[PDB]
Coordinates of C-alpha atoms and ligand atoms in Angstrom, one line a residue:
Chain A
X1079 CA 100.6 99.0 79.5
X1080 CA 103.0 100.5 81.3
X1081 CA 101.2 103.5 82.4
X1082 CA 104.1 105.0 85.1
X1083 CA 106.9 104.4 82.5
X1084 CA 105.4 106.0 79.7
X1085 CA 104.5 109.3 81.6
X1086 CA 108.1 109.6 83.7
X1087 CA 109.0 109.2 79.8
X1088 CA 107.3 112.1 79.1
Chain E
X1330 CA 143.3 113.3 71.3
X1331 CA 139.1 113.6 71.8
X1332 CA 136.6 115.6 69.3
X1333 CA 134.2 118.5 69.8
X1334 CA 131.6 115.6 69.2
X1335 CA 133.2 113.5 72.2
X1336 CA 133.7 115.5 74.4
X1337 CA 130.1 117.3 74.1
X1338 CA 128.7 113.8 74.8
X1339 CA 131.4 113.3 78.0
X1340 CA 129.7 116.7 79.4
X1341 CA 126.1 116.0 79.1
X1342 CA 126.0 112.6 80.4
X1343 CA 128.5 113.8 83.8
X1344 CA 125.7 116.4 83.7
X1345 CA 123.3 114.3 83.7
X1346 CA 124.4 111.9 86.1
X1347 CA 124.8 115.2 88.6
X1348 CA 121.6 115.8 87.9
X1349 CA 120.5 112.6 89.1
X1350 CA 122.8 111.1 91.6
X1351 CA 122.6 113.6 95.0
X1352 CA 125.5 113.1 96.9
X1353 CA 123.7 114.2 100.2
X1354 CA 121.1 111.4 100.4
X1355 CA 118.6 113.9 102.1
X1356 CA 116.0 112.3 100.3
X1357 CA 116.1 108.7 101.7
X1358 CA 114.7 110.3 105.1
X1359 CA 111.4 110.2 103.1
X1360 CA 111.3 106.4 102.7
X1361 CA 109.8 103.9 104.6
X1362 CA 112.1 104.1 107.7
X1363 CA 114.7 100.3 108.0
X1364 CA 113.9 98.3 109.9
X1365 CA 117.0 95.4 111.4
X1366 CA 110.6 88.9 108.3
X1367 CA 111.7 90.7 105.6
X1368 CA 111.9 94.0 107.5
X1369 CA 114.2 95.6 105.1
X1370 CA 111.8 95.1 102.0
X1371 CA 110.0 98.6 102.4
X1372 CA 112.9 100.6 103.3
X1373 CA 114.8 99.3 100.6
X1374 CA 111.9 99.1 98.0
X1375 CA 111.3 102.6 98.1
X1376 CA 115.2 103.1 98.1
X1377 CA 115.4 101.0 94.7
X1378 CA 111.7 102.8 93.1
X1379 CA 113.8 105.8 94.0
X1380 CA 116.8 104.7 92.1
X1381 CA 114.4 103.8 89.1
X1382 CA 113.4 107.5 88.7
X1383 CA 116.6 108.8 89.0
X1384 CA 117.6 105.9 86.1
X1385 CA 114.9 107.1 83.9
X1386 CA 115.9 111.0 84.2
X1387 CA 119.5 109.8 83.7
X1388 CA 118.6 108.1 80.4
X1389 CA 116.9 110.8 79.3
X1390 CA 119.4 112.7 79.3
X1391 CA 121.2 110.4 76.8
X1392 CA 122.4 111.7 73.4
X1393 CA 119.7 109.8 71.4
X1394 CA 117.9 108.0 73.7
X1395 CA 114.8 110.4 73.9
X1396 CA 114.6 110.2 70.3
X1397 CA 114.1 106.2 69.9
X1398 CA 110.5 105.0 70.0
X1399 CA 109.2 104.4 73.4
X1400 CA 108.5 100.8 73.1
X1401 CA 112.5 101.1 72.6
X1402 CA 113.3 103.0 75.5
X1403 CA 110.4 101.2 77.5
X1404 CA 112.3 97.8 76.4
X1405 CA 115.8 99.0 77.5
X1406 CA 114.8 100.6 80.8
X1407 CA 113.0 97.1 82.2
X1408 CA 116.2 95.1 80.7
X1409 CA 118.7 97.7 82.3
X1410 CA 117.2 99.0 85.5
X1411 CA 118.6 96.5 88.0
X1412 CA 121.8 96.9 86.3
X1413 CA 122.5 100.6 86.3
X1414 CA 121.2 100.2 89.6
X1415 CA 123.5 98.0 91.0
X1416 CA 126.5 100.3 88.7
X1417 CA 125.6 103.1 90.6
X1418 CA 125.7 101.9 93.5
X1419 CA 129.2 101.6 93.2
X1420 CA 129.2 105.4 94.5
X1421 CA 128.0 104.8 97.8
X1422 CA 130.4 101.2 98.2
X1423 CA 132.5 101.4 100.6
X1424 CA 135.7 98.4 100.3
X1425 CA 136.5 99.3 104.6
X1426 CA 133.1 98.3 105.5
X1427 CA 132.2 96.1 102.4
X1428 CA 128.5 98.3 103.0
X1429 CA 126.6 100.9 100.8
X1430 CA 127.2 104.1 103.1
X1431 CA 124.2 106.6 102.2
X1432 CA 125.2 109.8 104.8
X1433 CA 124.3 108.3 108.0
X1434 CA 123.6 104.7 109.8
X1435 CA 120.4 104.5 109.3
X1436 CA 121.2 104.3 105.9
X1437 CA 124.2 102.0 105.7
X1438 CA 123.6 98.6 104.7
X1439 CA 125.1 95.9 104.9
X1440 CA 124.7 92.4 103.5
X1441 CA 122.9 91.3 106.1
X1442 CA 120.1 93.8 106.0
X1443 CA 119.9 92.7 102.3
X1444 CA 118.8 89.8 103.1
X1445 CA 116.3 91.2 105.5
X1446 CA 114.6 91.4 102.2
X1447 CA 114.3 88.0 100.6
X1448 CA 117.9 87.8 99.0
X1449 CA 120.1 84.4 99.4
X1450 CA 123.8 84.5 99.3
X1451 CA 123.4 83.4 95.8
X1452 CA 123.1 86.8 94.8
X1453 CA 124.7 88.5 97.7
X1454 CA 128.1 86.9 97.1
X1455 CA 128.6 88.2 93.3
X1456 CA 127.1 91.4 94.2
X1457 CA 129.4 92.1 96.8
X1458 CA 132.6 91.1 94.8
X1459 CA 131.1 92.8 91.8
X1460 CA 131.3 95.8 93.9
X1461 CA 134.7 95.2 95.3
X1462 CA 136.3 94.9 92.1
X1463 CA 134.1 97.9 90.5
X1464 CA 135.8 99.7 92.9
X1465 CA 139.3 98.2 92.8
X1466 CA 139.3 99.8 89.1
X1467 CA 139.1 103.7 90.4
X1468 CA 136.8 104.9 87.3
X1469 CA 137.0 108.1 86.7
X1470 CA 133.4 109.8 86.6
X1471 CA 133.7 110.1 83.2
X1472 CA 134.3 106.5 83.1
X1473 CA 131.3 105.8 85.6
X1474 CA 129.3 107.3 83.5
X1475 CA 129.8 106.3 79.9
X1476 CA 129.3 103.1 81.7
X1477 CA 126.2 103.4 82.7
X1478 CA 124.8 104.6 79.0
X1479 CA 126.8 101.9 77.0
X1480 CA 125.1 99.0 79.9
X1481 CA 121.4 101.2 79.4
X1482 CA 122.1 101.6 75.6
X1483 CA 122.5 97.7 74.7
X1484 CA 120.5 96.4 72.1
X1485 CA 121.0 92.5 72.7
X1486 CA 118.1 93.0 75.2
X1487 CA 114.3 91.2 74.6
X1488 CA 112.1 93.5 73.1
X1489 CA 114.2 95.9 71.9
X1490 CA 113.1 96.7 68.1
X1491 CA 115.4 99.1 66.8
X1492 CA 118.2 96.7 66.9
X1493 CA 120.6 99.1 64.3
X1494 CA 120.0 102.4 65.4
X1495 CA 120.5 101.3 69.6
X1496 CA 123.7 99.7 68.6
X1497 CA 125.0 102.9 66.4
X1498 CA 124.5 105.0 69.4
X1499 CA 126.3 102.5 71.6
X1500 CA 129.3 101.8 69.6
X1501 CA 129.8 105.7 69.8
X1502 CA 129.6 105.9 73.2
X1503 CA 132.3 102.8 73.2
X1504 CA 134.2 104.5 71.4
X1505 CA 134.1 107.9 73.6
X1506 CA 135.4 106.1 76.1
X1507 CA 137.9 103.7 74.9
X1508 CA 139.5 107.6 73.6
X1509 CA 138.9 108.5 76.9
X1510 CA 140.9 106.1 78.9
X1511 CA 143.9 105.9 76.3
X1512 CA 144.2 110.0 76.6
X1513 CA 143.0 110.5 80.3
X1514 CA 143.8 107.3 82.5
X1515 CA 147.3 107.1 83.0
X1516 CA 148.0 103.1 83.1
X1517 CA 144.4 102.9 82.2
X1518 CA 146.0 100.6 79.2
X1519 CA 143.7 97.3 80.2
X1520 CA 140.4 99.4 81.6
X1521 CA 138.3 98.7 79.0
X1522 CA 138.6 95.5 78.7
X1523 CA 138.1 94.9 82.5
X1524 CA 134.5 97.6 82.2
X1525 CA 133.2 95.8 79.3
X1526 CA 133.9 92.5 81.5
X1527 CA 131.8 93.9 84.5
X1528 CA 128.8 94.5 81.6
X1529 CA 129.3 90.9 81.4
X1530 CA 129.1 89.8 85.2
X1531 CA 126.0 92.7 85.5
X1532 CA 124.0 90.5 82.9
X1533 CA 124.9 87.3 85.6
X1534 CA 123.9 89.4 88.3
X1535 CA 120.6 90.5 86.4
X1536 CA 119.6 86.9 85.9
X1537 CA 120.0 86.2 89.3
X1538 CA 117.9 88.9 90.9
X1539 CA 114.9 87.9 88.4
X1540 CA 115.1 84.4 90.1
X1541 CA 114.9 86.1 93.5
X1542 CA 112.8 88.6 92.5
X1543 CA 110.0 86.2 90.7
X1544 CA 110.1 84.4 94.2
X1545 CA 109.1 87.5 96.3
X1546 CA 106.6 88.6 93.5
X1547 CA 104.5 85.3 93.2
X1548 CA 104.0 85.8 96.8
X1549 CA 101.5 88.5 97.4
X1550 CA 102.6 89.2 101.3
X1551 CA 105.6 90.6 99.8
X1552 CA 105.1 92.1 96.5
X1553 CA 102.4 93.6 98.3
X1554 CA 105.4 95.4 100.6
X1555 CA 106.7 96.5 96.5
X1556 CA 105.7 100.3 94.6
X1557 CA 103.9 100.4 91.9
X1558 CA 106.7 101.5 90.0
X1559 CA 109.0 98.6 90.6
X1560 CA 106.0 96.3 89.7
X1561 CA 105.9 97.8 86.5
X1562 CA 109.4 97.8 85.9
X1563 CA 110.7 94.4 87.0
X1564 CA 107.4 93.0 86.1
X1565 CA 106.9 90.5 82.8
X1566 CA 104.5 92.6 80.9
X1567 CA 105.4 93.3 77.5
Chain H
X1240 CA 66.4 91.4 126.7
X1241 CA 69.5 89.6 124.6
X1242 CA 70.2 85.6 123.9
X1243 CA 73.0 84.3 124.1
X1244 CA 73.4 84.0 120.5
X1245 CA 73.3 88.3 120.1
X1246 CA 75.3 88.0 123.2
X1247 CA 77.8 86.2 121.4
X1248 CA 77.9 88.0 118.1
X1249 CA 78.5 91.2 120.0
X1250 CA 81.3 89.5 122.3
X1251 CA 83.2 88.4 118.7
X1252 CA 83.2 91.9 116.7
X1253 CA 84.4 94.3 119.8
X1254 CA 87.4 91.0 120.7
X1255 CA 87.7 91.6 116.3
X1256 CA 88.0 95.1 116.8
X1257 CA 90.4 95.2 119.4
X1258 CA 93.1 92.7 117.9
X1259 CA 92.5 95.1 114.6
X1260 CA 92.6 98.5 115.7
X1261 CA 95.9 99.6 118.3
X1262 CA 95.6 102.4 120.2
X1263 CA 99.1 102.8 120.4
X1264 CA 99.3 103.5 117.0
X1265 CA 102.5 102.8 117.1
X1266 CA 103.1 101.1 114.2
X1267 CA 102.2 104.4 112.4
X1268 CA 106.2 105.4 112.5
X1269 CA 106.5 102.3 109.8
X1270 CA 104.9 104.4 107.6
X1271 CA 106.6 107.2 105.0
X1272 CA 106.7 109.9 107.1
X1273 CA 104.3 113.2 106.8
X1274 CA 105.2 116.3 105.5
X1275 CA 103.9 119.5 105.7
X1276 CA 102.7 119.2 96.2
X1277 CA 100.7 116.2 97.3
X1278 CA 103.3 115.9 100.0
X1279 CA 101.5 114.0 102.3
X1280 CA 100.6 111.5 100.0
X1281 CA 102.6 109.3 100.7
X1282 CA 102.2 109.4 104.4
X1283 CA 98.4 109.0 104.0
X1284 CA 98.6 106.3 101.1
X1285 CA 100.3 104.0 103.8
X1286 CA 97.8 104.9 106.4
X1287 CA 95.3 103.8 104.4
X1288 CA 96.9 100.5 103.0
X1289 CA 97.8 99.7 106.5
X1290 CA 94.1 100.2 107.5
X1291 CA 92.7 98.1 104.8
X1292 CA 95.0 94.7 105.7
X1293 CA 92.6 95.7 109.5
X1294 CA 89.0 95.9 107.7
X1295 CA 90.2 92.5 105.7
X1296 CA 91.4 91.3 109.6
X1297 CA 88.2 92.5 111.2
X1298 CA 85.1 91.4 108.3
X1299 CA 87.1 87.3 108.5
X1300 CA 86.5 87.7 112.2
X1301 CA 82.6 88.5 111.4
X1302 CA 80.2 85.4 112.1
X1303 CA 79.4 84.0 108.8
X1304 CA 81.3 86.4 106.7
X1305 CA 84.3 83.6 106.0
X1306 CA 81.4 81.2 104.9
X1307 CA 80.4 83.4 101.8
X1308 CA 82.2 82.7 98.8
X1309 CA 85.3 84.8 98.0
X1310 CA 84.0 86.7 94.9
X1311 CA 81.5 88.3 97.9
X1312 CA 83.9 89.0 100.5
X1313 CA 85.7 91.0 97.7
X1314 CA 82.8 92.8 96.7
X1315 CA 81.6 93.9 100.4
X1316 CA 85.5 94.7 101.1
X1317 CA 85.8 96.7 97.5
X1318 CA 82.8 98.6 97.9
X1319 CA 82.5 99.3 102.1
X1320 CA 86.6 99.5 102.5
X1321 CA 86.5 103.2 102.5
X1322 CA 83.4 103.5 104.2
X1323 CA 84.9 101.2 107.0
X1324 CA 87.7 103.6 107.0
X1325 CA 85.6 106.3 107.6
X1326 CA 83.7 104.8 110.7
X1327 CA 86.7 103.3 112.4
X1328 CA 88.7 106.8 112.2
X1329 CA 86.5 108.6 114.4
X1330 CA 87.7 106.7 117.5
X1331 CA 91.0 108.9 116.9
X1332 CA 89.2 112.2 115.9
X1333 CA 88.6 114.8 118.7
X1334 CA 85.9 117.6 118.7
X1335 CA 88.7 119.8 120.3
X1336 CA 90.9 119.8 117.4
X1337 CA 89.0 119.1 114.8
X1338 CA 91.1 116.3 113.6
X1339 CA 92.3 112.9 113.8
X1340 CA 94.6 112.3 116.4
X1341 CA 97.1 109.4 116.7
X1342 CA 99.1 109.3 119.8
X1343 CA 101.3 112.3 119.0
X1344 CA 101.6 115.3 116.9
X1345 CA 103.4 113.7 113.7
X1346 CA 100.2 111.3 113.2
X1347 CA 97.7 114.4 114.1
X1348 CA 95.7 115.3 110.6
X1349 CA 94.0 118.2 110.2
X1350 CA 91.7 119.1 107.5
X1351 CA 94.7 120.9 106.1
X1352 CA 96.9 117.9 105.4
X1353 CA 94.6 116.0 103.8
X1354 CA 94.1 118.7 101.4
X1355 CA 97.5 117.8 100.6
X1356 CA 96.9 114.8 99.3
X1357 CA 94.5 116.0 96.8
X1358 CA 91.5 116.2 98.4
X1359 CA 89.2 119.7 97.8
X1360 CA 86.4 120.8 100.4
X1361 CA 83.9 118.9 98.6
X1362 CA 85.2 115.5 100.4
X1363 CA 86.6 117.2 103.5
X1364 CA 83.9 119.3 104.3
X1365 CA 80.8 116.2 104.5
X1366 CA 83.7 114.2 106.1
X1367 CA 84.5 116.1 108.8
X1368 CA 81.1 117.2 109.8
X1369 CA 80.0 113.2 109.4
X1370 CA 82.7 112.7 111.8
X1371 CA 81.7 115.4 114.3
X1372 CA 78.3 114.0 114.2
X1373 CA 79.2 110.5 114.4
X1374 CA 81.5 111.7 117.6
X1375 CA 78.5 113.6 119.3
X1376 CA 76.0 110.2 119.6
X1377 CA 79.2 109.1 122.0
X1378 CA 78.6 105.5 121.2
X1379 CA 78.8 102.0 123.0
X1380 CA 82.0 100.5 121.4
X1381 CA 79.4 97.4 121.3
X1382 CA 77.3 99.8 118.6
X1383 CA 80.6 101.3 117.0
X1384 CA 81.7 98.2 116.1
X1385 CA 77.5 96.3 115.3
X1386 CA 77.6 99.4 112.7
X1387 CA 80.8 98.6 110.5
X1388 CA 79.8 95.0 110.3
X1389 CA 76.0 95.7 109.5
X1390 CA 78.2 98.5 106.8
X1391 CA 80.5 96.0 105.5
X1392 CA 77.5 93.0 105.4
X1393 CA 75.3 95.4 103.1
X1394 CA 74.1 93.4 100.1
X1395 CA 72.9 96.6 98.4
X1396 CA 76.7 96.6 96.9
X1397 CA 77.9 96.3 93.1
X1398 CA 79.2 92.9 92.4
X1399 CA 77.4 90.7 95.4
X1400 CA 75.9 87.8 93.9
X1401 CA 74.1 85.9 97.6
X1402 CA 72.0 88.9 97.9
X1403 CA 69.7 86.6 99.9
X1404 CA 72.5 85.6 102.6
X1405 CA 74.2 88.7 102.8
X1406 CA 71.0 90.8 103.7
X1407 CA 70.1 87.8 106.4
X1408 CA 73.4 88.4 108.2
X1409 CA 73.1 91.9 107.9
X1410 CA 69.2 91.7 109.6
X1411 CA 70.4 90.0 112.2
X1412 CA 73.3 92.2 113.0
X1413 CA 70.4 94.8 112.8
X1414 CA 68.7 93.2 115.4
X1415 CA 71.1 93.1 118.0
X1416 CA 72.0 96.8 117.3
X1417 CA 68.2 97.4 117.8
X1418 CA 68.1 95.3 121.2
X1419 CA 71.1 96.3 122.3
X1420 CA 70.2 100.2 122.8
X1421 CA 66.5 98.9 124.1
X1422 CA 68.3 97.2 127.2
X1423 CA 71.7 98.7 127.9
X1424 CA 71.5 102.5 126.5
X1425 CA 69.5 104.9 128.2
X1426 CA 67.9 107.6 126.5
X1427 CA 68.9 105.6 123.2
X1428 CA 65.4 106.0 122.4
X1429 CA 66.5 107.6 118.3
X1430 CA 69.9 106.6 118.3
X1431 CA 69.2 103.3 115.8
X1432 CA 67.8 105.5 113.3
X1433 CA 70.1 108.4 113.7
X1434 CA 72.6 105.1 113.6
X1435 CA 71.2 104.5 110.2
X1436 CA 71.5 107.8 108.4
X1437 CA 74.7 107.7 109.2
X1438 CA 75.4 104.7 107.1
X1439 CA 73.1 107.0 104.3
X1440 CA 76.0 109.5 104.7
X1441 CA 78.5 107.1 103.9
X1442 CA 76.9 106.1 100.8
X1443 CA 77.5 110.2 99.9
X1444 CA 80.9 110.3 101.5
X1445 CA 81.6 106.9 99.3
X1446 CA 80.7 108.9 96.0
X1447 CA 82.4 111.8 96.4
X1448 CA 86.0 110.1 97.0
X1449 CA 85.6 108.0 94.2
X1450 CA 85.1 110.9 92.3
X1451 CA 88.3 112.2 93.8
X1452 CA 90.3 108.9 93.6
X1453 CA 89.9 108.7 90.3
X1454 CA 91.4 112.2 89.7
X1455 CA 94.3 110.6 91.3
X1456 CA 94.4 107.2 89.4
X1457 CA 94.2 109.0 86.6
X1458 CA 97.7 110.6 86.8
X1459 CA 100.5 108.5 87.2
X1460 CA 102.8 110.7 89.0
X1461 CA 100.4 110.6 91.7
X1462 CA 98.7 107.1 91.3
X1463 CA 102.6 105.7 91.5
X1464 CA 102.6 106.9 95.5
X1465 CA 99.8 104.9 95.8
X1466 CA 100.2 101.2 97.1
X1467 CA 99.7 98.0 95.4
X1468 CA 96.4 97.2 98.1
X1469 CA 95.1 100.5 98.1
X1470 CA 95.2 100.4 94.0
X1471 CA 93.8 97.1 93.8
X1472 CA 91.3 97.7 96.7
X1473 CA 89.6 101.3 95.2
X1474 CA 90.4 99.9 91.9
X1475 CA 87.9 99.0 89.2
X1476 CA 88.4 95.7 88.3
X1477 CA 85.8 93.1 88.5
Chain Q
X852 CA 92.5 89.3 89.6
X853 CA 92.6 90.8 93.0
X854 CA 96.0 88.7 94.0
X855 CA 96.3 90.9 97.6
X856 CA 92.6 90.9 98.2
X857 CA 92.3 86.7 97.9
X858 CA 95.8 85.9 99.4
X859 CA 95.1 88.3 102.3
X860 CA 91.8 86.7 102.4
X861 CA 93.3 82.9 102.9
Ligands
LIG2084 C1 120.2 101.9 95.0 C2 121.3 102.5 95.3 C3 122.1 102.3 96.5 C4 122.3 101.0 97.0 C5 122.0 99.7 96.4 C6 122.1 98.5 96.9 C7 122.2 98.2 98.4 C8 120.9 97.7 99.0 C9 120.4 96.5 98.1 C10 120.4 96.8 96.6 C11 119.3 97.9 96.3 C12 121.8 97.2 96.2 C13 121.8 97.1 94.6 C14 120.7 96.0 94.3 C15 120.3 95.5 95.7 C16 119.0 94.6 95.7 C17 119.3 93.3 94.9 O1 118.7 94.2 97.0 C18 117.7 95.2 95.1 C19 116.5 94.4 95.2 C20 115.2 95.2 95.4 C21 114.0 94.5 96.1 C22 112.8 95.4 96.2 C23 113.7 93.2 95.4 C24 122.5 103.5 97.3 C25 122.9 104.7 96.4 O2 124.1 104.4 95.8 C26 121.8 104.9 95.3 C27 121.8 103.7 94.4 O3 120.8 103.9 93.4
LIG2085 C1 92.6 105.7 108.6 C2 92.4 105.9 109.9 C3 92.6 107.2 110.6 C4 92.4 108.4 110.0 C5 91.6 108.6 108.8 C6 91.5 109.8 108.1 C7 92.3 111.0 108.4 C8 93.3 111.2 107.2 C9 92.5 111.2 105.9 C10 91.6 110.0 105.7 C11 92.4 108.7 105.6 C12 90.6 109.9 106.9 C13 89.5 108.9 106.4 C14 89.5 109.0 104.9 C15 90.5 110.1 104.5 C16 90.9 110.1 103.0 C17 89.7 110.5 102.2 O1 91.9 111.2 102.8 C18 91.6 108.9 102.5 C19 92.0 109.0 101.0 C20 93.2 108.1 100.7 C21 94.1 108.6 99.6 C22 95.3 107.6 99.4 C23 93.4 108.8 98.3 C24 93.4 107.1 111.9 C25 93.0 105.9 112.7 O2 91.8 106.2 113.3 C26 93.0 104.6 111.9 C27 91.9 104.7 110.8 O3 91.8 103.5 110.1

């Protein structure tokens, strides 16, 4: 669930 | 003549952009080193992982975009990525060696190192003149840059929810710029017709690197070779 | 005395081992370089990826560990990976330094740079005096390389399903361990047990960086440095 | 479902 994306997304 | 409103959204995204694009290329030293099958595919999947993070920061950075919903942003940055990457790319083109020249040989390649990493001609060819005539068009990095947010802020991309509010922001930024160029860019008079153009060809260009990327990531060998980050990104999931 | 069946299992693992382990190391360049937060990371993610793809190269080359069926191979190679790690490292570590040593000073780890890629004293400390103890029997590469097959053919692991042919490969790699340091090592008289605890430490060792691991997987900025095999090898998916 | 692992496997 898009973990990476979400967090560099803050 | 440009507003208070304009012009405010000309400096954060140049700002933005500097704050995300380093000129020196120190960095790519910490890649997987090139290597001239498929040699290239580490070097230059950590090189475009690399370029995803800058992306992201860049978009960030946006006037608006932090506020949509993440599925929103999420949706724009998977449709996008490839495309802003290959826009800023532009930066390191070089039209006397027809290369992308990042501060040293090492890391100056050419389109046959490209293909040292799965890539036909199919897509090398319109990349290539894409480039060319990118660069024929001597944008100003104002220019560059609006660019880059009206191609990331598109909201005819699948899964995008937010249709109205995506294409509000964009049609501002459009509008920044088409000021822009009829203020700033002396002869500039058919510039935006020949940017929003090259939005055009970058969509052509994205459907032809899904082809050639589905290919390398249906074979584990390779995607194996891939980052985590560029799996999720140019990966299906929704 | 050995048969010529123990004869032959021995003369397949140490040929396995050698086209799976170089002692040139030279390949090691290939990987994102070292530097000296998590900064070595990277460096060490590919070290370990790259010594994965030899574990998966060297349990195929085991006699009848092909013939199981591939849900077991994953589960011995999910389970013992690390472990396998752990065992086949020491042939670079030097009592000396303290450290693991690969043909030159940018591939020599200390216990310092593997702290910097998020490991406490809790995993470097047992590690480092396992490997210090394991370095001290000065084993037969024949016994180095009976004891990671007997490791990676133990049934005892989550997920096997032919307990029963698992743990009669293992016996009889047991066995010719056992004969082995009868005939051809002298004064071998405990070295099959202290052989044994050693594969009890693992167990331990095992534990403690799955503890640790999962710290890492946890948090994206660190678990995206990882690679695709090493998150899909000490990942928890069934 | 352990693509790596099985390819890698043959
Ligand atoms: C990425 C950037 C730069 C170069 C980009 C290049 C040259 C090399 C080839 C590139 C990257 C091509 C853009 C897409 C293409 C590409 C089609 O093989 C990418 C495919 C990736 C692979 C893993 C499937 C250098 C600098 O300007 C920074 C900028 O962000
Ligand atoms: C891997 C090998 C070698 C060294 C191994 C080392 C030194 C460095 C630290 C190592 C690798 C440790 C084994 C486990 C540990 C480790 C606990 O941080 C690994 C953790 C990995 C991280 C991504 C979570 C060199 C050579 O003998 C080849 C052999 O296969």
């Amino acid at each position: 669930r898009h973990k990476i994306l979400h967090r560099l997304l803050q | 003549m440009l507003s208070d409103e304009q012009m405010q959204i000309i400096n954060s995204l140049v700002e933005a952009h500097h704050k995300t694009y380093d000129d020196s290329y120190s960095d790519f030293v910490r890649f997987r080193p090139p290597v001239r099958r498929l040699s290239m595919l580490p070097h230059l999947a950590d090189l475009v992982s690399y370029s995803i993070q800058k992306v992201i920061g860049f978009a960030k950075m946006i006037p608006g975009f932090r506020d949509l919903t993440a599925e929103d942003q999420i949706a724009l940055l998977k449709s996008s990525a490839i495309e802003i990457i290959m826009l800023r790319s532009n930066q390191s083109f070089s039209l006397e060696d027809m290369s992308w020249s990042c501060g040293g040989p090492d890391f100056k390649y050419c389109i046959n190192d490209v293909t040292k990493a799965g890539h036909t001609l199919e897509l090398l060819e319109p990349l290539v003149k894409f480039q060319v005539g990118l660069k024929k068009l001597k944008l100003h990095e104002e220019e560059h840059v609006l660019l880059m947010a009206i191609c990331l802020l598109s909201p005819d991309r699948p899964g995008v929810q937010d249709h109205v509010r995506i294409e509000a922001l964009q049609d501002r930024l459009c509008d920044v710029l088409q000021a822009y160029i009829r203020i700033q860019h002396p002869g500039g008079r058919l510039l935006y017709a020949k940017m929003i153009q090259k939005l055009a060809d970058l969509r052509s260009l994205n459907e032809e690197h899904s082809k050639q990327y589905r290919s390398l990531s249906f074979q584990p060998e390779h995607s194996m070779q891939l980052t985590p980050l560029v799996l999720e990104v140019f990966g299906s999931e929704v």
